[PDB]
Amino acid sequence: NYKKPKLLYCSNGGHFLRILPDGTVDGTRDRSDQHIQLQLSAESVGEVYIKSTETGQYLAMDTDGLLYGSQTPNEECLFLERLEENHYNTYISKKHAEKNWFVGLKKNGSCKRGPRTHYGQKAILFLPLPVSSD
């Protein structure tokens, strides 16, 4: 929904998307941790910039693959609110439209990279959930 900061669950391993203060991005399961609270906004129709509410870092790879959090609203942070008919969402890089880099979840809570995602994955389908056990 619009309203709230919401969390990104990726079904592969279930991980929630969380941005640690040093800038690096993975997911793990405890939903007490402080950095999975994200609220989203739109520069435009197609895309969204995601930011951890408490520490104020957006998500931005660069060609990199290396899923990092940037301090600046820059040309690294802007990925696609993809809603596929299986109702999960997904998110793929600004940097391109090139070759489907997408946001992932390796089964072990260590996703990366974008060269090796595409060809599936189940690593990529995310759900927006609420704060609570609502």
Binding site: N1, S41, A42, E43, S44, R82, N86, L129
Partner: protein
């Protein structure tokens, strides 16, 4: 003396997964003997029937999966794996989501038309709603032929400046129609506003 055997993916405690999908809870384990098993969704026993389409089980690698999911079977679901020598168990929360891949829904009746003396001025309002996160903007038909834009969203202008127009010392400049564009991938449309001005 029963024991859970290969944490395959018990580290997947949560399974958020959209309506009608399915969803596989496994609880292998072991111990001598075969441990009768049973299962719990936040309480005492859960059987079948309490779901239409039933259940179907495996007392063969003992686990559970079911399928075409709906929101009313929400909750925590508990492995329990016992013999005479003890018992083990695990618990899985299930979170059924429901998306509407339509484009933003707009409240009936907004924004509503208004009027005040010049030098005064009053507002028109838009309400978000609600899934594919919308990108939002108002326009007005002036100029000789097209409308021209209020100012964007994601423009670094947040939850506050949210159109909620503000019209300082309302001139007759402003005279005309005001409309409310907010889109996602599905498309976009809304209703609209004229100002009855003095």
């Amino acid at each position: 003396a029963p024991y859970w055997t290969n944490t395959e993916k018990m580290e997947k405690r949560l399974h958020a997964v959209p309506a009608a999908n399915t969803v596989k809870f496994r609880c292998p384990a072991g111990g001598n003997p075969m441990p009768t098993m049973r299962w719990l969704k936040n309480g005492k026993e859960f059987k079948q029937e309490h779901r239409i389409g039933g259940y179907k089980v495996r007392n063969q690698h003992w686990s559970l999966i079911m399928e075409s999911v709906v929101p009313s079977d929400k909750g925590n679901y508990t492995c329990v794996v016992e013999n005479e020598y003890g018992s083990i168990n695990h618990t899985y929360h299930l979170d059924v989501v429901e998306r509407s891949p339509h484009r933003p829904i707009l409240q009936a009746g907004l924004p509503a038309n208004a009027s005040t003396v010049v030098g005064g001025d009053v507002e028109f309002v838009c309400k978000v709603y609600s899934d594919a996160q919308p990108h939002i903007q108002w326009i007005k038909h002036v100029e000789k032929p097209y409308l021209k834009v209020l100012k964007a969203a994601g423009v670094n202008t947040t939850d506050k400046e949210i159109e909620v127009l503000y019209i300082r010392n309302v001139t007759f400049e402003d005279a005309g129609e005001y409309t409310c564009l907010a889109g996602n991938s599905i498309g976009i449309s809304f209703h609209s506003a004229w100002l009855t001005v003095l």
